[PDB]
Amino acid sequence: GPLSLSVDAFKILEDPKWEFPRKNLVLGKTLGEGEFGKVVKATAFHLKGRAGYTTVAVKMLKENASPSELRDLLSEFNVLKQVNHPHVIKLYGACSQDGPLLLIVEYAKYGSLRGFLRESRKVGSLDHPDERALTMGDLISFAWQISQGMQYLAEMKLVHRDLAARNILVAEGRKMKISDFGLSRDVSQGRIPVKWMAIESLFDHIYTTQSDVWSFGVLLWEIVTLGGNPYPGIPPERLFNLLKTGHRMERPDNCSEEMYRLMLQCWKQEPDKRPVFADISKDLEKMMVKR
């Protein structure tokens, strides 16, 4: 079947560029864990012709993994090979010759954007009750970096499908990296959380760059609320009809008119009425120079 073919292709030595010798990989602490998959920190010796040990993250399956897990991981590997951008997580390679399949990716010292934000406070060698302080300028900065990454992906004819604050990684110098390409595809029951999905994805199962834009609007909302939970107290099952009848999230606190207007436009019912990612970057670039 399609998976046994990919598995077998993967387990052969066909891509010497991406194969990393297993003996050169030393696995450390767990960075995150779900039921069937795990991410650990690691050091990699002589990775990609680099001197000494490079700090990396390793993605791997757990023992109760289903074929849909195996598929997601292999599919991410195949997408990340074709991709190169400062705001997209970097793939270093894979170990396919010695035990479990391991994906080796760039290590993001702050972890997920969602985590980063909830540990922060909004403002206008000591110590504080919060990890850091963030201005609207930082938040606009974060959104712009993601929109750049997304513009690159849309130009590459790739639909991410799972855009959300938990899938953006925060690297050294607070650089945003789009991550989790398990569900991406080159442009039936979906595995994207309902609350981030575009109306046409929910009703017609259609996924395009414009449905990525809708998801981007939910992420913006997540950013300006510093890690809020979208549609709080509304059951995911109730959301279809609220959206169909034209309900949207209200303007959050500490959110400006111009910022909220951009969110709303991302959530237009007709995908043609939504901004493209270039328009989005433009809006953020303008906000920035204008303080």
Ligand X SMILES: COc1ccc(CN2[C@@H]3C[C@H]2CN(c2ccc(-c4cc(OCC(C)(C)O)cn5ncc(C#N)c45)cn2)C3)cn1
Question: Which CB sits closer to ligand X, 168 or 263?
Answer: 168
Question: Can you give the binding site for ligand X, defined by CB under 6 A?
Answer: 31-34, 37-39, 57, 59, 61, 69, 72-73, 105, 107-111, 115, 169, 179, 182
**Do 56 and 105 contact (CB within 8 A), yes or no?**
yes
Site string for a second copy, 101-120 (x = CB under 8 A): x-------------------
Q: Choose the one of a second copy, ligand X, none that binds residue 38, judging by a C-beta under 5 to 8 angstroms depending on kind.
A: ligand X
Q: Identity (one letter) of the amino acid at 257? A: E
Number of residues located near a second copy, criterion CB under 8 A: 43
- Active-site residue, 98 included: no
Classified as helix, coil or strand, 232 is: coil
User: What is the rounded CA–CA span in Å between residue 26 and residue 259?
Assistant: 44
Among 84, 229, 254, 256, binds a second copy (CB under 8 A): 229
Residue 63, SS3 per DSSP: coil
85-112 burial: b if 16+ Cβ within 10 Å, else e: bebbbbbbbbbbeeeebbbbbbbbebbb
CA separation for the pair 262, 222 (Å, rounded):
14
Q: Residue 172 interacts with a second copy (CB under 8 A)?
A: no
The residue among 5 and 51 lying less far from a second copy, judged by its C-beta, is 5
Q: Which stretch binds a second copy (CB under 8 A): 50-58, 109-117, 130-138, 189-197?
A: 189-197
Residue entry with tokens 């609220």: 242
CA pair distance 86, 82, nearest whole angstrom:
14
Pattern 238-277, binding to a second copy, x per CB under 8 A? x-xx------------------------------------
Query: How far is residue 220's CA from residue 227's CA, in Å, rounded to a whole number?
Result: 10
Is residue 144 within 8 Å of 281, Cβ to Cβ?
yes
CB atoms within 10 A of CB 166: 19
Q: Residue 59: name its binding partner from ligand X, a second copy, none (Cβ under 5 to 8 Å by kind).
A: ligand X
Alpha carbon distance, N-terminus to C-terminus of the chain: 55
Q: Annotated binding residue at 17?
A: no
Per CB under 8 A, the segment of 39-47, 83-91, 98-106, 278-286 that binds a second copy is 98-106
Catalytic entry in 72, 162, 212, 283: 162
37 is in an annotated binding site: yes
Residue 203 corresponds to which tokens in the numbers above? 């009703």
Active-site positions read 162
Binding region for semaxanib:
106-108
Which residues here bind a second copy, judged by CB under 8 A? Answer: 1-4, 7-8, 11, 34-36, 61, 63-71, 99-101, 188-195, 197, 202-205, 229, 235-238, 240-241
